[PDB]
Design a protein around this ligand. Structure first.
Ligand code: ZN
Length: 195
């Protein structure tokens, strides 16, 4: 099967948000609204905001999962390449095979679907704290889009789902990701190409 990627705000008005990091050559993570695409460096922090119109129930969770963007690759589980899954860079919680990790959250759970074999990382949804209007999760992508034996230059999508305590769907959003050496340059190049 293939996880759905349909945008769904649901009852709580759930949707993602991204910082405005610009496209300077040195930027490590930058988001393109025009392409709905995040460009980032290997294993660098990717701040992703969670916005809702109303606070969901206690026990609500947020899951991140990568899938190949191209239909001809959709059924293939997105995983780290043969090199990176063996480079011993685990943080003591993320299995080394997982492409997406969550930083600084001891309650992060890493799932290997016994049915689909797909990987995902889920954390408890936390309401925004005093002074903030949104909640931010910091993700890391652990392979380059170009890694041989892994993504092998195939574009991927990250699907973020708001789930209830049983894993049922409350909301969904998604964005394309390109893990590269120079996000700033790549984003400028791709948006130019789009122009
Ligand atoms: Zn890799």
């Amino acid at each position: 099967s293939v996880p759905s990627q349909k945008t769904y705000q649901g009852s709580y008005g759930f949707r993602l948000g991204f910082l405005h990091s610009g496209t300077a050559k040195s930027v490590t993570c930058t988001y393109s609204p025009a392409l709905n695409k995040l460009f980032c460096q290997l294993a660098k922090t990717c701040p992703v905001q969670l916005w809702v119109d109303s606070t969901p129930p206690p026990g609500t969770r947020v899951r991140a999962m990568a899938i190949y963007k191209q239909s001809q690759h959709m059924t293939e589980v997105v995983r780290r390449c043969p090199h990176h899954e063996r480079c011993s860079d685990s943080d003591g919680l993320a299995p080394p095979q997982h492409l997406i990790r969550v930083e600084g959250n001891l309650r992060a759970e890493y799932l290997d679907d016994r049915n689909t074999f797909r990987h995902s990382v889920v954390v408890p949804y936390e309401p925004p704290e005093v002074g903030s209007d949104c909640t931010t999760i910091h993700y890391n992508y652990m392979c380059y889009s170009s890694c041989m034996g892994g993504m092998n230059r195939r574009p991927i999508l990250t699907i973020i789902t708001l789930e209830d305590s049983s894993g049922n769907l409350l909301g969904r959003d998604s964005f394309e990701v390109h893990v590269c050496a120079c996000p700033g340059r790549d984003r400028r190049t791709e948006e130019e190409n789009l122009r």
